[PDB]
């Protein structure tokens, strides 16, 4: 199960994940492949922020999805 991730810069980083995996985990995987701090990693899907306290299954996020990675207060 792979999922796309939209990076403000312009990169679609597709990371490995499972439906049982948590958002807090997915954050690490990003900080381990892109070096982006979790506290500075905002994930929004379907028009609603993903809680590091919930799993993909919570937001019914299936494979080939499309997450949106934003930054705290974007000035650009």
């Amino acid at each position: 199960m792979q999922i796309f991730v939209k990076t403000l810069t312009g990169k679609t980083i597709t990371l490995e994940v499972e439906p049982s995996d948590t958002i807090e985990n997915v954050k690490a995987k990003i900080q381990d492949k892109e070096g982006i701090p979790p506290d500075q990693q905002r994930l929004i899907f379907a028009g609603k922020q993903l809680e590091d306290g919930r799993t993909l299954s919570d937001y019914n996020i299936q494979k080939e999805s499309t997450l949106h990675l934003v930054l705290r207060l974007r000035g650009g």
């Binding site: 929004i44 028009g47 609603k48 705290r72 974007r74």
Partner: protein, 57 residues
């Protein structure tokens, strides 16, 4: 230039624009940030994800 956003995205920040299903954003322009677009919605100019907006011309 006016797009139609079919979704229920809620502005998370001040520079973020709230785009909801059917809400058309005036003069939408693609920013230097992938997915981020800027436009005028509800009298407020803000940026919003492209995966929630659909260009309607």
């Amino acid at each position: 230039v006016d797009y139609i956003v079919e979704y229920d995205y809620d502005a998370v920040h001040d520079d973020e624009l709230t785009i909801r299903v059917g809400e058309i954003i005036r003069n939408v322009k693609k920013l230097q940030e992938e997915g981020w677009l800027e436009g005028e919605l509800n009298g407020r100019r803000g940026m919003f994800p492209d995966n929630f907006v659909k260009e309607i011309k």
